[PDB]
Write a protein that binds this ligand. Structure first.
Ligand code: CLA
Ligand code: CLA
Ligand code: CLA
Ligand code: CLA
Ligand code: CLA
Ligand code: CLA
Ligand code: CLA
Ligand SMILES: CCCCCCCCCCCCCCCC(=O)OC[C@H](COP(=O)(O)OC[C@@H](O)CO)OC(=O)CCCCCCCCCCCCCCC
Ligand SMILES: CC1=C(/C=C/C(C)=C/C=C/C(C)=C/C=C/C=C(C)/C=C/C=C(C)/C=C/C2=C(C)CCCC2(C)C)C(C)(C)CCC1
Ligand SMILES: CC1=C(/C=C/C(C)=C/C=C/C(C)=C/C=C/C=C(C)/C=C/C=C(C)/C=C/C2=C(C)CCCC2(C)C)C(C)(C)CCC1
Ligand SMILES: CC1=C(/C=C/C(C)=C/C=C\C(C)=C\C=C/C=C(C)/C=C/C=C(C)/C=C/C2=C(C)CCCC2(C)C)C(C)(C)CCC1
Ligand code: SF4
Ligand code: SF4
Lengths: 80, 42, 170, 31, 143, 170
C-alpha cells in the first residue's frame, strides 16, 4: 500500500479529496486553519498512486505527499 | 577434411557430452528448480 | 433505449452482461460446443489420465512430422524420422515437466486465480492437483507412444506403401 | 607435449572441491 | 442482499474476470428518476432503469468513475449512489460513502488518519533511520 | 551431567531421544532433505502413478547399460543393445510383480508394521494399497518406456553421433 501523508500547511480547500479517483481521502475538523478542515487518508489501502491529490494541492510545497510503497492488487490497479 | 566436429585434444569425447548437458539437458531442470523456488508459498 | 432491448445474435455470457465475455457463435453455438465439450480436455466424466492419454496420443503423433520434412536430417529418410521422433520426445518431456511444475507451484494451499475454490471458470475444469498429476502422466504416456507410433509408420513407409497398393498379394 | 586424458580427469575431479564449496557458501549466504 | 435491477446492457469483454470472483468485486447502486443511457466504465453504453440500479464492477475506481459520471453528466444529478465491496464468500461491505455523508464534505466524527504535524521540508533526513525499518514519513519527530 | 545438556550437531530424531534414530547431517540437513524430499518417492502432492512413472523412467533407462557393455552379446552392437533391453525388461517385470504381490500380501485388513494405521514412519508414505497398485502400474510403464528409450538411443548411436558432431549439415 502507498502512504499518503498530510502536513500542517493544509488549508482545507478539499481539492485533493475531490481529485481522488479511488476515495482514499476525506476532510476532518481541525481548527488548525481558518477553513476548519484538514485532509485525512484512512482508506490508503485503496490508493493507486496516481498523485492527482498532489496535482490538486495549491500549497507550496505540497500539504499532501504520496509515497509509493508495497504493491498490492489494488495499488496496481488490476481488474484481473 | 572436416566433415564433422572433432577434437585434436585430450579427452575429446568430453565436449560431445558436456555441451548437451550444460546447454539443453540440465537447463530445463534448473529452470524448473528455480521456478519452484520462486513460486513456493509461505 | 436499445441497450439489450432488441434480441440480437450476440448475447451476454451466461446471461450476465457484467461478465467479461460475450456469447458469440464461436463459443456458444451447438456445433462449436458439441466439438469443444467433447474434446478430451472437456469430455464429461473422464478421468484425468484418460483425458491426458488421448491428448498425448493426438499430439505426439503430429509432432514427429515437422522435423521429418524440414529438419537437418531431411536429406535421408531414416535420420529424418529419428530427428522427428526425438523432437517429439523432447517437446513432450518439456511440456510434461511444465505441467508437473505448474501443478506443483499452483496448488499450494488454496490456489490463486482460476484454481481457487471460489473460481467460476468453466473452461478450466481440472481443479485438483491430483487431476493435474494424472493428466501429466497420461499426456507423457500417450505422447511418447503416439510419437513412436508415427515414427514406426514412417520407418516402415516402404512396407505400408506396398500394403496400401496391394503389392503384398503376389 | 599435450595434456593427457588423466590430466583432464584430474581437473574434472579437483574442480568438485570449489564446486561444492561454492554451493556451501551460496546456501550459507541464505537465499 | 443488494437491491436493484441490473442496467440494460448487452455485455462486453470489459466486464468481470476471474479475479472478480477469487479476490473481490464491487457493486454500485443508484436511483434514477428516468430510464436513460449512461457510459459503462468498461466500455460501451448501458441504460439505467427507472428506480433502483445495481451494477457489479471489478475495481473501486470503476465504481467511482461511474459515480462521478452519474453526478456530473446527468440533469438532475444522481448523487445517491452507494458502493459496496463483495468478497468471494459472499460478504458485502458498504465502503462508499465510508461515513455516510461524502468525503468532500466535513463530518464531525471521522478522525485523523494521515495527519503529520510537520511542514514536509522537516522530515527526519535518512542517515538516522537506516537500520530501523521506518522511512522518513512513518516517524514522529521533526528535524 | 553432559547427556543432552550441551548443544551438539547430532540431535535426537524429531526431538525425541527415545526414538531409534539420530538427527545427523545425512538425514537432517537442508541439502539432504531438499534432495530426498523432492525425489519422486517423496515429492509432496504427487499421485502414486506419476511418482512411479518418473521412478521407472529413471530406472529402466540406466538398467540397459550393464548388459550392453558386459553381457554375453557384448562383442556385437545390435545384440548387446538387445540383451540390455531385455534384461531391463525382465528386471522391471520381476520388480513390478514384487510390488504387486507386496501390496497384495501386506494390505490385508489392518496391515502389520509400517503400513499399520498407527505407524509413524515418515519414510514410507504409501499407506494405501491403491497407492501401491498405482505405483506398480506407473513403475512398469515408465521403466519399460525408459528401457526402450535407452535401447533406441543405443541402436541409433551412429546417427546420434553424426548429429552431435554436426555431420548431418553437409
Ligand atoms: C559475484 C557474483 C555473485 C555473488 C557473490 C552473489 C551473492 C549472493 N547472492 Mg546473487 N546473483 C548474481 C550474482 C552473485 N550473487 C547474479 C548475476 C544474479 C542475477 C541472476 C543474482 C541474483 C540473486 C538473487 C535473486 C538472490 C541472490 C542472493 C545472493 C546472496 C545469497 C547467496 C545465494 O543464494 O546465491 C544466489 C542465487 C542465485 C540463483 C545466483 C544466480 C546464479 C547465476 C547467475 C544463475 C545462472 C543460471 C543459468 C541459467 C544456469 C542454467 C544452466 C546450468 C545447467 C549451468 C549472496 C550474498 C539471494 C539473497 O538472499 O540476497 C541477499 C537472492 O535471493 N542473488
Ligand atoms: C569460469 C571459467 C570457465 C569458462 C568461461 C569455461 C567455458 C567453457 N568450458 Mg570449461 N572448465 C573450467 C572453467 C571454465 N570453462 C575449469 C576450471 C575446468 C577444469 C575442471 C573446465 C573443464 C571443461 C571441460 C571438460 C569442458 C569445458 C568446456 C567449456 C566450453 C563449453 C561449456 C561447458 O561445457 O562447460 C563445462 C564445465 C565444466 C565441466 C566445469 C566448469 C567448472 C568452472 C570452474 C565453473 C565456473 C563457474 C563460474 C566461476 C561461476 C559464474 C557464475 C555465473 C554468474 C556465470 C566453454 C567455452 C567444454 C569444451 O571444451 O568445449 C569444446 C568441455 O567439455 N570446460
Ligand atoms: C491462436 C489463435 C487464436 C486464439 C487463442 C483465439 C481465441 C479466441 N477467439 Mg479467435 N480467431 C482466430 C484465432 C484465435 N482465436 C483467427 C485466426 C480468426 C479468424 C479471423 C478468429 C476469429 C474469431 C471470432 C469471430 C471469435 C473468436 C473468439 C475467440 C475467443 C473464444 C473462442 C472460443 O471459445 O473458442 C472455440 C473454438 C472453436 C469453435 C474451434 C474452431 C476450430 C476451427 C478452426 C474453426 C477466444 C479468446 C470469439 C470471441 O471473441 O468471444 C467473445 C469470437 O466470436 N475468434
Ligand atoms: C510443419 C508442419 C507439418 C509437417 C512438415 C508435417 C508432416 C507430416 N505429417 Mg503432419 N500435421 C501437422 C503439421 C505438419 N505435418 C498439423 C499442424 C496437424 C494437425 C494436428 C498434422 C496432422 C497429421 C496427421 C494425422 C498425420 C500427419 C502425417 C505427416 C507425415 C505425412 C505423411 C507421410 O509421410 O507418410 C504417409 C502416411 C502414413 C505412412 C500413414 C497414413 C495414415 C494412417 C493410415 C492413419 C493414421 C491414423 C489416423 C490419424 C487416425 C485418426 C484418429 C482420429 C482423428 C479418427 C509428414 C512427415 C501422417 C503421419 O504422421 O504418418 C505417420 C499422418 O497420419 N500429420
Ligand atoms: C518462425 C520462424 C522460423 C521458422 C518457420 C523456422 C523453421 C525451421 N527452422 Mg529455424 N530458427 C529461427 C526461426 C524459424 N525457424 C530463429 C529465430 C533461429 C535462431 C536465429 C532459428 C534457428 C534454427 C536452427 C539452428 C535450425 C533451424 C531449423 C529449422 C527447420 C526445422 C525446424 C523445425 O521443424 O522445428 C519443429 C517444429 C515444430 C515441432 C512445430 C512447428 C509449428 C507447428 C507446425 C504449428 C502448426 C499450427 C497449426 C497450423 C494450427 C492448428 C490449428 C488447429 C485448429 C488444428 C525449419 C524449416 C533447423 C534446420 O536444420 O533447418 C533446415 C536447424 O538446425 N532454425
Ligand atoms: C546401500 C548402502 C547404504 C545404505 C542402505 C545406507 C543407509 C543409511 N545410512 Mg549410510 N553410508 C553408506 C552406505 C549406505 N547407507 C556408505 C557407503 C557411507 C560412507 C562410509 C555411508 C555413510 C553414512 C553416514 C555418516 C550416515 C549414514 C546414515 C544412514 C542412515 C540414514 C541416511 C539417510 O537418510 O539417507 C540420506 C540420503 C542422502 C543424503 C543421499 C546421498 C547421495 C550421495 C551419494 C551423497 C541409513 C540407514 C546416517 C545415520 O546413520 O543415521 C543415524 C549417517 O549419518 N551413512
Ligand atoms: C555396470 C554399470 C554400468 C554400465 C556398464 C553402464 C553403461 C552405459 N551407460 Mg550407465 N549408469 C549406471 C551404470 C552403468 N552404465 C549407473 C549406476 C547409473 C546411475 C543411475 C547410470 C546412468 C546412466 C545414464 C543417465 C546414461 C547411462 C548411459 C550408458 C551407456 C553409455 C553411453 C553410450 O553408450 O552411448 C552415448 C550416449 C548417448 C547415445 C545418449 C547421450 C545422453 C543423452 C544426450 C541425454 C540422456 C538423457 C538424460 C539422462 C536426461 C537427464 C534427466 C534428468 C536427470 C535431468 C552405456 C552402455 C547413457 C545411455 O544409456 O545411452 C542411451 C546415459 O545417458 N548411464
Ligand atoms: C556447473 C556444473 C553444472 C551445474 C548444475 C548445478 C547448478 C546448481 C543447481 C542448484 C541446486 C542447489 C539447490 C539447493 C537446495 C537447498 O539446499 O536450499 C537451501 C536454500 C533454501 O533452503 P531452505 O532453508 O528453504 O531449506 C529447507 C528445506 O531444505 C528443509 O528444511 O536455497 C538456496 O540457498 C538457494 C541458493 C543456491 C544458489 C546456487 C548457486 C551456487 C552455485 C553452485 C554450484 C554447484 C556445483 C555443483 C557441482 C560441482
Ligand atoms: C478441428 C477439426 C479438424 C482438424 C482435425 C485435426 C486437427 C486433425 C487431426 C488429427 C490428429 C493429430 C490425429 C492423431 C492421431 C493419433 C493416433 C492414431 C495415435 C496413436 C497411437 C498409438 C497407437 C500409440 C501406440 C503405442 C503406445 C501407446 C505404447 C507403445 C508404443 C506404441 C506405438 C505401440 C478439421 C478441420 C480437419 C475438421 C474436423 C475438426
Ligand atoms: C545423487 C546425485 C547424483 C546422481 C544422479 C544420478 C544417479 C543420476 C542419474 C541419472 C539417470 C538414471 C537419469 C535418467 C533418465 C531418464 C530418462 C530421460 C527417461 C526416459 C524416457 C522416455 C522418453 C521413454 C519414452 C517412451 C515411452 C515411455 C513409451 C513408448 C516408448 C518411448 C521410448 C517413446 C550426482 C552425484 C551425479 C549429483 C546429483 C545428485
Ligand atoms: C569424482 C570422479 C570423477 C568425476 C568428476 C565429474 C563427473 C565431475 C564434474 C563436475 C565439475 C568439474 C564441476 C564443477 C563446478 C562448479 C563450480 C566450480 C562452481 C561455481 C561457482 C561459484 C564460484 C559460485 C559462485 C556464486 C557464489 C559465490 C554465490 C552464489 C552466486 C554465484 C553462483 C555467482 C572422475 C571420473 C573424473 C575421477 C574419479 C572420480
Ligand atoms: S495518489 Fe491518487 S488514489 Fe492515492 S490518495 Fe492521491 S489521488 Fe487518491
Ligand atoms: S488539496 Fe492540499 S491544501 Fe487542499 S485539502 Fe488537500 S492536502 Fe489540504
Amino acid at each position: 500500500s502507498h502512504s499518503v501523508k498530510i502536513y500542517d500547511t493544509c488549508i482545507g480547500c478539499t481539492q485533493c479529496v475531490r481529485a481522488c479517483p479511488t476515495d482514499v481521502l476525506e476532510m476532518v475538523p481541525w481548527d488548525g486553519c481558518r477553513a476548519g478542515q484538514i485532509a485525512a487518508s484512512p482508506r490508503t489501502e485503496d490508493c493507486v498512486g496516481c498523485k492527482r491529490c498532489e496535482t490538486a494541492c495549491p500549497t507550496d510545497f505540497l500539504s499532501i505527499r504520496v509515497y509509493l510503497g508495497a504493491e498490492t492488487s489494488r495499488s496496481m490497479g488490476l481488474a484481473y | 577434411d572436416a566433415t564433422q566436429l572433432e577434437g585434436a585434444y585430450a579427452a575429446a569425447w568430453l565436449p560431445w557430452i558436456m555441451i548437451p548437458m550444460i546447454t539443453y539437458i540440465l537447463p530445463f531442470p534448473i529452470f524448473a528448480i528455480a521456478f519452484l523456488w520462486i513460486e513456493r508459498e509461505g | 433505449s436499445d441497450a439489450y432491448i432488441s434480441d440480437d445474435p450476440i448475447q451476454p455470457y451466461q446471461g450476465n452482461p457484467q461478465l467479461g465475455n460475450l456469447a458469440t457463435p464461436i463459443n456458444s453455438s451447438n456445433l462449436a460446443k458439441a466439438f469443444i465439450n467433447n474434446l478430451p480436455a472437456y469430455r464429461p466424466g473422464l478421468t484425468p489420465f484418460l483425458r491426458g492419454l488421448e491428448i498425448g496420443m493426438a499430439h505426439g503423433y503430429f509432432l514427429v512430422g515437422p522435423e521429418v520434412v524440414f529438419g537437418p536430417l531431411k536429406e535421408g529418410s531414416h535420420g529424418a524420422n529419428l530427428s522427428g521422433l526425438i523432437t517429439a520426445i523432447y517437446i513432450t518431456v518439456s511440456a510434461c515437466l511444465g505441467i508437473s511444475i505448474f501443478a506443483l507451484a499452483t496448488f499450494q494451499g488454496d490456489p490463486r486465480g482460476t484454481y481457487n475454490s471460489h473460481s467460476r471458470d468453466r473452461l478450466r475444469p481440472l481443479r485438483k492437483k491430483e487431476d493435474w498429476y494424472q493428466l501429466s502422466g497420461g499426456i507423457l504416456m500417450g505422447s511418447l507412444g503416439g510419437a513412436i507410433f508415427a515414427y514406426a509408420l514412417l520407418e516402415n513407409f516402404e512396407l505400408l506403401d506396398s500394403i496400401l497398393r496391394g503389392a503384398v498379394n503376389v | 607435449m599435450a595434456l593427457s586424458d588423466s590430466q583432464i580427469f584430474l581437473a574434472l575431479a579437483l574442480a568438485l572441491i570449489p564446486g561444492f564449496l561454492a554451493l556451501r557458501l551460496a546456501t550459507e549466504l541464505y537465499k | 442482499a443488494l437491491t436493484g435491477s441490473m442496467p440494460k446492457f448487452g455485455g462486453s469483454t470489459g466486464g468481470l474476470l476471474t479475479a472478480a470472483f477469487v479476490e473481490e468485486r464491487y457493486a454500485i447502486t443508484w436511483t434514477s428518476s428516468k430510464e436513460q443511457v449512461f457510459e459503462m466504465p468498461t466500455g460501451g453504453a448501458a441504460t439505467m432503469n427507472e428506480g433502483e440500479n445495481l451494477l457489479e464492477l471489478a475495481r473501486k475506481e470503476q465504481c467511482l468513475a461511474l459515480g462521478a459520471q452519474l453526478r456530473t453528466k446527468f440533469k438532475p444529478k444522481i448523487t445517491d449512489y452507494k458502493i459496496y465491496r463483495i468478497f468471494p464468500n459472499g460478504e458485502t461491505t458498504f465502503i462508499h460513502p465510508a461515513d455516510g455523508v461524502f468525503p468532500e464534505k466535513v463530518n464531525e466524527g471521522r478522525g485523523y488518519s494521515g495527519k503529520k504535524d510537520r511542514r514536509i521540508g522537516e522530515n527526519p533526513n535518512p542517515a538516522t533511520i537506516k537500520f530501523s525499518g521506518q522511512n522518513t514519513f512513518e516517524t514522529d519527530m521533526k528535524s
